[PDB]
Design a protein around this nucleic acid. Structure first.
Ligand SMILES: Nc1ccn([C@@H]2O[C@H](COP(=O)(O)OP(=O)(O)OP(=O)(O)O)[C@@H](O)[C@H]2O)c(=O)n1
Ligand SMILES: [Ca+2]
Ligand SMILES: [Ca+2]
Length: 438
DNA sequence: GGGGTGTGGTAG
DNA sequence: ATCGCTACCACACCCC
């Protein structure tokens, strides 16, 4: 057991945190794309007509954890048992659940306690541990397979288990659904063989947004080809409002209040007006949704195709720790901040950059919230506070950055015992060139 | 027109 | 028990 005032805390927390792993994996995939394309002119141009193959592992962690499960779980049956991946037994996040579990209403991100209550009597939830290294190994096989097939002009990493793959179609060639179905089946089979049993689904379209929706439609373990010319009421009727990219719970709530609780993208499509949309959810998001309901990408989303180097370049660096934060005094807080600064500066030096601006963000227990919340070591209900500072001279000096971070904490006034979370951010990064003469 | 801040949301 | 991360866009409200 490692407490937050123990020097090993950051290492142990990050070693256990699937959300840390996900961000670290995504960051590494981005750096790798940039390094492998340092000299290639890697970008779709306006001259190209393209097809999007949006490819994603089905129940990634659950699939891999099951395939690599220990002897204690040998008799577990992936097609018949409800399976989740999590650390704990009660207020522990379900990071992944298989589709048997989803058939009972279980969803990623539920707590185990919640998920158990959805099972009929006699049916047992199987909980598998995380297998972080094997998650990474399976992803390696995935990305290696995509490259080996030599059918994509551009392979864009989205995450450990997801990529957007672009095929340019010369319009001396005649693309067909049959050719695209063959490609989907090739991809699916080769990844199945290369991952030793993981399944991917695939959405295939002529827009990013349609490929994403097609992917949702294809799951589990299938593919869906829906081009703009194929659109129909049957298609839009199949989606919830938050299936749209950019629509989370808060945008969901807003659209439901504004448009009389639409229950499908078809409902929304028939009811909205661009102007009422913008008023509900904002100008840019409103325009994005409008275009999405036409099967069309917005300018911002298209940047990944036309300048992936820029989109995938990292522009800030941070850590967030909002679990296990229980400090008795300001000395221990300050030492934790210093440990976080050290960790961040290692990351900053690995990419050979300096920072010109930093931010400290904290979570403070709400005045009326229990000191020990429902989730063990959780942040519980908090108020958030943030403050930033320009450094003037770009720097990677620990002395300067750590002192300023600790000062930022001081200015926010949070008593150490009330602290429940901390985020440390380098907001602006500056390249380090060969010329460092003042 | 240019600049800034803290906050909020979504992704994956 | 249990590991509630992190990047980046968008916005509302300030300055000139
Ligand atoms: N609340 C959540 C939701 C997602 N995940 C993780 O985020 C990654 C991507 O999840 P996603 O693709 O959205 O879901 P899958 O579990 O792969 O299921 P599916 O794609 O078939 O819907 C997976 O490693 C998953 O474990 C998580 O840790 N916490
Ligand atoms: Ca997935
Ligand atoms: Ca994914």
């Amino acid at each position: 057991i490692v407490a937050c005032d123990d020097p090993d805390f950051l290492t142990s927390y990050f070693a256990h945190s699937r959300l840390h792993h996900l961000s670290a994996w995504k960051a590494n995939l981005k750096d790798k794309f940039l390094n492998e394309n340092i000299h290639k002119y890697t970008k779709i141009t306006d001259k190209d007509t393209y097809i999007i193959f949006h490819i994603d592992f089905d129940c990634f962690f659950a699939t891999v954890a099951y395939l690599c499960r220990s002897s204690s779980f040998s008799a577990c049956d992936f097609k018949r048992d409800p399976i989740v991946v999590c650390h704990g037994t009660k207020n522990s996040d379900i990071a992944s659940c298989n589709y048997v579990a989803r058939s009972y209403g279980i969803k990623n991100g539920m707590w185990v306690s919640q998920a158990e209550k959805m099972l009929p009597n006699g049916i047992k939830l199987i909980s598998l541990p995380y297998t972080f290294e094997q998650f990474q190994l399976k992803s390696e096989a995935f990305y290696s397979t995509l490259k080996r097939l030599n059918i994509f002009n551009l392979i864009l990493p989205i995450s450990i288990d997801e990529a957007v793959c672009v095929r340019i179609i010369p319009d001396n060639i005649h693309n067909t659904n049959t050719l695209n179905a063959r490609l989907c089946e090739e991809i699916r089979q080769e990844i199945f063989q290369g991952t030793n049993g993981c399944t991917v689904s695939i959405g295939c379209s002529d827009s990013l947004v349609l490929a994403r929706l097609a992917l949702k439609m294809a799951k589990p373990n299938g593919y869906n080809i829906t081009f703009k010319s194929n659109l129909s009421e049957e298609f839009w009727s199949s989606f919830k409002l938050d299936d749209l990219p950019g629509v989370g719970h808060s945008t969901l709530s807003r659209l439901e209040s504004t448009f009389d609780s639409p229950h499908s993208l078809n409902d929304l499509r028939k009811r909205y007006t661009l102007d009422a949309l913008k008023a509900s959810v904002g100008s840019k998001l409103g325009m994005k949704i409008h275009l999405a309901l036409q099967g069309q990408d917005d300018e911002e989303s298209l940047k990944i195709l036309y300048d992936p180097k820029e989109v995938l370049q990292r522009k800030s660096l941070s850590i967030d720790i909002n679990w296990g934060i229980r400090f008795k005094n300001i000395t221990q807080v300050d030492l934790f901040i210093e440990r976080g600064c050290q960790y961040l500066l290692e990351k900053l030096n690995e990419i050979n950059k300096t920072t010109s601006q930093i931010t400290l963000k904290l979570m403070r227990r709400c005045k009326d919230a229990p000191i020990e919340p429902p989730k063990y070591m959780g942040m519980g209900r908090c108020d958030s506070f943030s403050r930033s500072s320009r450094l003037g001279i770009p720097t990677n000096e620990f002395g300067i950055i750590a002192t300023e971070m600790k000062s930022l904490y001081r200015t926010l006034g949070c008593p150490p015992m009330e602290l429940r979370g901390l985020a440390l951010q380098f907001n602006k990064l500056v390249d380090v060139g060969p010329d460092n003469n003042q």
